[PDB]
Amino acid sequence: DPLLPGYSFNAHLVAGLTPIEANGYLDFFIDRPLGMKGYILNLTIRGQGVVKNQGREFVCRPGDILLFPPGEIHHYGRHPEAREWYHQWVYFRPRAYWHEWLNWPSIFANTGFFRPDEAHQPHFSDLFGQIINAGQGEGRYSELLAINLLEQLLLRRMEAINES
Amino acid sequence: DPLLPGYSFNAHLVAGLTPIEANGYLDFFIDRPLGMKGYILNLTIRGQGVVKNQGREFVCRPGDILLFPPGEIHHYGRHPEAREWYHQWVYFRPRAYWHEWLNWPSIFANTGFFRPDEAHQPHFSDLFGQIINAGQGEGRYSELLAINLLEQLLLRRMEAI
Ligand SMILES: O[C@@H]1[C@@H](O)[C@@H](O)CO[C@H]1O
Ligand SMILES: O[C@@H]1[C@@H](O)[C@@H](O)CO[C@H]1O
């Protein structure tokens, strides 16, 4: 189960939805102090989460997208004053030419943040969901599609931030 | 105007819609007898076209997707029995790893053909429209986005067959 400790993330893209509910089986903090081998993109869809990094804390809310590069600390979970923290996520290894699009302004350390304009929220949420659906497919082209959709999301962000 | 002959198609992706109407300004056959350097994907969205190749003819209708690889003859226009032939198209240079997804069954010579089933039709039409939108947009990422959406279409076809 990728939603619980013990799972091995390495070369393959893995995607899912973590529906944390207070006092439930997922009500614990993701705690990977040494970081991961690949990247993780995280979209909050309901509730609130608290992201911690060496004494600092950041409250993420529905519509916020976070970026965790390889080696970066992962220490986040349901915000103590929130009933839940539902977040979609995708673990991945980038294609070579994606690096310009992985340069996001940090909330702290090297943990990136992106929040689409309210008007664009629906598209990004829908796109993120398409990534999960593809990521969890078993077809010969499932992973390739998930990777492609992720690339689309990174490009849509590039257009979004440069819209003016 | 890429819609008119003499346009220089080279390394940049170019996309558009050619709304051919009988007797209108676009009512002529595209004719590139020695082909092009890049690929062209073509989706018919209205009316009917006639694709020709050294005497042979193929009538394409709404929902038909054709693939013209580099060097392939381009000779096509409004079908004589149709009042129009609106087709969306995208000229491109592929990413290296796309080649395994570009070997489509051919109507003749090496002109590929793909007709999504009725269930997949709306999604592919929707996707092609997004390609044209991205390809015609302004900014430093319009072309990359179009390339991205194109790769998606290629992958959805592989998945659909
Ligand atoms: O819930 C977590 C998710 O936030 C991401 O870190 C991947 O692993 C899952 O277990
Ligand atoms: O209308 C054509 C189109 O079909 C494609 O060949 C690109 O060039 C345009 O002029």
Swiss-Prot record, chain A:
Compartments, as annotated in UniProt: Cytoplasm
Induction comment: Negatively autoregulated. Autoregulation is either greatly reduced or nonexistent immediately after the addition of L-arabinose. Transcription is stimulated by CRP in the presence of cAMP.
Binding site for alpha-L-arabinopyanose: 2, 18, 32, 76, 87
Annotated signal peptide: none
GO process annotations (BP): arabinose catabolic process
Domain remarks in the Swiss-Prot or TrEMBL record: Contains an N-terminal domain that binds arabinose and mediates dimerization, an inter-domain linker region, and a C-terminal domain that binds DNA. Arabinose is bound within a beta barrel and is completely buried by the N-terminal arm of the protein. The DNA-binding domain contains seven helices arranged in two semi-independent subdomains, each containing one helix-turn-helix DNA binding motif, joined by a 19 residue central helix.
Protein name: Arabinose operon regulatory protein
Gene: araC
